[PDB]
Design an enzyme around this catalytic site. Structure first.
Site, PDB file in Angstrom:
ATOM      1  CG  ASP A 271     -45.267   1.482 -52.097  1.00  0.00           C
ATOM      2  OD1 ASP A 271     -45.502   0.581 -52.812  1.00  0.00           O
ATOM      3  OD2 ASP A 271     -45.349   2.890 -52.096  1.00  0.00           O
TER       4      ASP A 271
ATOM      5  CG  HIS B  90     -44.809   3.524 -55.658  1.00  0.00           C
ATOM      6  ND1 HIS B  90     -44.296   3.717 -54.255  1.00  0.00           N
ATOM      7  CD2 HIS B  90     -43.791   4.531 -56.336  1.00  0.00           C
ATOM      8  CE1 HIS B  90     -43.175   4.371 -53.934  1.00  0.00           C
ATOM      9  NE2 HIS B  90     -42.927   4.797 -55.308  1.00  0.00           N
TER      10      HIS B  90
ATOM     11  CB  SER C 203     -39.671   4.814 -55.478  1.00  0.00           C
ATOM     12  OG  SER C 203     -40.308   5.689 -55.294  1.00  0.00           O
TER      13      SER C 203
END
Length: 216
Positions: free
Chosen positions: A93, A51, A169
């Protein structure tokens, strides 16, 4: 995801020990920017989230990587620009970002020591771990270490009880040997934080794309 366990400490001596490979990521979007984190794992390579790299809208050159960033005005290792995005083909991810050399024709894995990846042979629930990277609630490009416990291991999913914030992230999840066991990708409020567990299959993907990968 901020949890009852929110034990976070800023890191200042960022270029030393295992912190050096922890990297700050900046991606402009016309309205503003997105930021995230990653970890240098090879001569030209970082690991981060799908992402995160997807924020570049297919152009790797929109991604700036600052290994060992201390704050917005102090990038002691400068920056490296995105060159090639290699997503993990599996259902996690995870992506490799290959970066170009810097203005001094230095490679990112020559300026900092590439992180040690765990084989995860010893990794278990209740294990004490850290997640270290660049939380979005903190000042831009400041590095923070969060302490927590593994609560769940299944497939490519590793969950822990420690707190993180948007911008986290892509942050490496370290064991006590300071080896990377996983890569943070998000969380479920009031329940846990989630990471890509570096299982045998992930390790194969790393070996096949990062010839020098250090797995111990």
């Amino acid at each position: 995801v901020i949890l009852p366990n929110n034990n976070r400490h800023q890191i200042f001596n960022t270029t030393q020990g295992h912190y050096d490979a922890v990297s700050f990521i900046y991606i402009p979007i016309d309205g503003g920017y997105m930021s995230g984190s990653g970890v240098v794992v090879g001569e030209n390579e970082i690991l981060t989230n799908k992402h995160v790299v997807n924020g570049a809208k297919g152009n790797p050159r929109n991604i700036s990587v600052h290994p060992s960033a201390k704050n917005e005005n102090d990038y002691p290792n400068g920056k490296f620009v995105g060159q090639e995005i290699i997503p993990y083909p599996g259902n996690s991810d995870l992506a490799i970002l290959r970066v170009s050399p810097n203005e001094h024709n230095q490679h990112i894995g020559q300026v900092v020591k590439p992180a040690t990846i765990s084989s995860n042979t010893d990794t278990r629930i209740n294990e004490n771990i850290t997640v270290t990277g660049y939380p979005g609630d903190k000042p831009l490009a400041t590095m923070w270490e969060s302490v927590g416990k593994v609560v769940y291991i299944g497939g490519e999913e590793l969950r822990y009880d420690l707190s993180t914030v948007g911008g986290n992230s892509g942050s490496p999840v370290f064991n006590g040997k300071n080896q990377v066991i996983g890569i943070h990708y998000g969380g479920v409020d009031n329940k846990y934080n989630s990471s890509v567990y570096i299982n045998d299959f992930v390790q194969q993907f790393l070996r096949n794309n990062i010839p020098d990968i250090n797995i111990q």
